[PDB]
Design a protein around this ligand. Structure first.
Ligand SMILES: Nc1ncnc2c1ncn2[C@@H]1O[C@H](COP(=O)(O)OP(=O)(O)O)[C@@H](O)[C@H]1O
Ligand SMILES: [Mg+2]
Ligand SMILES: [Zn+2]
Length: 685
RNA sequence: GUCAAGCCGAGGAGA
RNA sequence: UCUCCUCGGCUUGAC
């Protein structure tokens, strides 16, 4: 039933007899289909030889497992073989190693594999080896770089390859390694300023995958072009000539707080260097115990966030953001005040009497349809133009950086009627990150959105970086780029998603940022890498071989050194040689001896002395903890009945017993000293 | 069928 | 060395 194309045949041809190789063709050229044909050929070959053989497909995401368990492998190969798709959300029943030798055609998110490998290498948890396979197939090879996921697998593969080659000249017995087929669209250039460094990068990839060719289509090209096309590029620039009543109204507050602080930014309001200045200022102030300087740092950081979204989003969203923030703040203050406690503050009183007195005003200055936003009006024009031009023949995708962005966009495009009168149904899309003010999403919710859009029930999918790679849509036209430039790969992989006729690509930039600049940079890199590929394809085989062997050895030796600096590198097993203080206030909290651990992940104290100090701010089981001063400390945790209040070290501050170089660490794993697990013998009767 | 929390690794961007 | 964003994975719990 599965049908082929000609160029598919010629590009596949060498892989059909050994030849572990790489492929790169433009998006939507049957890469999956040619892979599927190679699967069928491989296994039929191994059976007609009466030999054993199995296949593992690797992706770098969680949708693609079921994407390709639904649409391309399973519908064609169900008859002759069993198939199974694995991800980070499919509740298995057996384990991974057992299904290595049960279903015979697997598909996996990557890290499942490496987990099982290092389990086989560390303990007796069953695990798996590479000799338990006959073929690895890869999608989106180009992530094979410095310390990525795929790279560890290929490091182990190359190590065993060199062992095989050392046994080539020492013994007869050697292990037959599995074949490797890599697929991509752009192997991509890793930050090279020239054509030659880019060539070197291609060779680094190819040696990190044990390649022999690339096999770009050149012969059967008319077939491609009559069958495949590209969109038309389009730039959309918009400049500001407004924002003096609102934006400057906030820069006013910034100057006011700085003149309350006596601290010079020495840079511009509304950027990242200003942020970094505030961050280091805060870290030093907490390293000094100085209040009045960390706190305006944190607030000015919030104002900078508000400005940076004001570069992208209306006044109203930032008003909402800081409304949530100071709402939480006043909640903490009232919770402290409402707990045999009488005291008042001077800083926080100043900040709040500075803000809330302008809260109503800024809400009044928020709602103004005149200067809503340049880029937003521009996309209104672009969108409505397209969705009027197509007459129900639309399928939309939108990209951006953050998620709060996406939520606001979906909300507001549900609000406005010019978008609803056309009936451009909308929904956003994100990866399962349980960290935001935003409400997170679920895997099943993601898949339902995929199905509703492929159904066409949604007309525009707002998507974060989960949606550059994959999402084999049947046919869509309109894709855009809301003020985002990362590299050449995101550009090309998004610019080729309109798998349909009369496709378009768009960028939406502000003139006050080097964005279209990097647009052109990525364009040049795209032109550059094809020339580099044409160079290496015409390379001599023996010279190619020598170079890839060099780079294999370089990758393996680099691992070893990165291992040498990580043998221990910090092994002071100093249990309680510290004191943890609060960070806002310089209030002592705990020592190291009262601390214990659960699950060898979570660090906690479980003594009444730490108990009778904090407050539980209400929304109910997982409660949030706060300080007496007003600092947030941690979250509750009900572990085996024990109501242990766990915390985050990033909120607290260090003070050693020896000489007190106060520091911040941002996470537990970084620091040297060790804490023990908690024997439950305590807290009994 | 629902929800919450924390931990870790990696990439990209910027400085 | 720092920051931001993003992604993938792992455990605990509650309905
Ligand atoms: N042999 C074939 N004949 C016709 N169309 C094909 C064939 N093989 C694949 N396709 C088309 O290719 C599309 C899949 O492209 P795909 O390779 O998944 O994109 P990407 O390369 O970005 O992963 C499908 O929509 C399908 O219609
Ligand atoms: Mg693909
Ligand atoms: Zn405190």
């Amino acid at each position: 039933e599965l049908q082929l194309r000609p160029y598919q045949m010629e590009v596949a041809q060498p892989a059909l007899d050994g030849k572990n190789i790489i492929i790169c063709l433009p998006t939507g050229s049957g890469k999956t289909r040619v892979a599927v044909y190679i699967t069928k050929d491989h296994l039929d070959k191994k059976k007609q030889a009466s030999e054993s053989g199995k296949v593992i497909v690797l992706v770098n995401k969680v949708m693609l497992a079921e994407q390709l368990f639904r649409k391309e492998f399973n519908p064609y190969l169900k008859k002759w073989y069993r198939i199974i798709g694995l991800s980070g959300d499919t509740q298995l029943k057996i384990s991974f190693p057992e299904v290595v030798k049960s279903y015979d055609v697997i598909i996996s998110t990557a890290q499942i594999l490496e987990n099982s490998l290092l389990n086989l290498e560390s303990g007796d948890d069953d695990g798996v080896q590479l000799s338990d396979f006959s073929l690895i197939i890869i999608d989106e090879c180009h992530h094979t770089n410095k310390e990525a996921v795929y790279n560890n697998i290929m490091r182990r593969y190359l190590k065993q390859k060199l062992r095989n080659n050392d046994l080539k000249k020492q013994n007869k017995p050697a292990i037959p390694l599995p074949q490797i087929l890599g697929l991509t669209a752009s192997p991509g250039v890793g930050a090279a300023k020239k054509q030659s460094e880019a060539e070197k990068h291609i060779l680094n990839i190819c040696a990190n995958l044990d390649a022999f060719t690339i096999k770009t289509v050149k012969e059967n090209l008319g077939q491609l072009k009559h069958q495949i096309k590209e969109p038309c590029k389009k730039f959309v620039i918009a400049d500001d000539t407004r924002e003096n009543p609102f934006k400057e109204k906030l820069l006013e507050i910034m100057a006011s707080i700085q003149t309350y602080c006596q601290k010079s930014p020495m840079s511009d309001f509304g950027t990242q260097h200003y942020e970094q200045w505030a961050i280091q200022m805060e870290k030093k102030a907490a390293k000094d115990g100085n209040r009045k300087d960390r706190v305006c740092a944190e607030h000015l950081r919030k104002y900078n966030e508000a400005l940076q979204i004001n570069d992208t989003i209306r006044m109203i969203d930032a008003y909402s953001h800081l409304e949530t923030f100071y709402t939480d703040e006043k909640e903490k203050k009232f919770a402290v005040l409402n707990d045999k406690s009488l005291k008042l503050d001077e800083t926080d009183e100043f900040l709040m009497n500075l803000f809330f007195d302008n809260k109503k005003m800024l809400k009044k200055l928020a709602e103004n349809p005149k200067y809503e936003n340049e880029k937003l009006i521009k996309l209104r024009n672009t969108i409505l133009e397209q969705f009027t031009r197509s007459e129900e023949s639309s399928r939309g995708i939108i990209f951006t950086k953050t998620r709060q962005s996406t939520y606001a966009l979906s909300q507001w495009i549900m609000e406005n009627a010019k978008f609803a009168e056309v009936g451009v149904k909308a929904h956003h899309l994100i990866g399962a990150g349980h960290s935001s003010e935003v409400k997170p999403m679920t895997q099943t919710e993601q898949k339902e959105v995929i199905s509703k859009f492929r159904t066409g029930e949604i007309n525009l999918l707002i998507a974060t970086t989960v949606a550059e790679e994959g999402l084999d849509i049947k046919e869509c036209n309109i894709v855009i780029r809301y003020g985002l430039v990362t590299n050449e790969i995101a550009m090309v992989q998004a610019r080729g998603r309109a798998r349909a006729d009369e496709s378009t690509y768009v960028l939406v930039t502000s003139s006050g940022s080097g964005v279209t600049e990097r647009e052109i940079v990525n364009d040049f890199r795209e032109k550059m890498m094809y020339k580099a590929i044409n160079r290496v394809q015409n390379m001599k085989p023996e010279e190619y071989a020598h170079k890839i062997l060099e780079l294999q050895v370089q990758s393996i030796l680099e691992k070893k050194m990165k291992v040498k600096r990580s043998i221990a590198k910090q092994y002071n097993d100093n249990p309680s040689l510290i004191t943890l203080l609060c960070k806002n206030c310089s209030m002592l909290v705990c020592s190291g001896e009262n601390i214990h651990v659960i699950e060898k992940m979570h660090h906690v104290n479980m003594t009444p002395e730490f108990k009778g100090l904090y407050i539980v701010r209400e929304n109910q089981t997982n409660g949030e903890i706060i300080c007496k001063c007003g600092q947030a400390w941690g979250t509750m945790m009900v572990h085996k009945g024990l109501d242990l209040p766990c915390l985050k070290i990033r909120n607290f501050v260090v003070n050693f017993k020896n000489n007190s170089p106060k520091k911040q660490y941002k996470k537990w794993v970084e620091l040297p000293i060790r804490f023990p697990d908690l024997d439950y013998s305590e807290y009994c009767l």
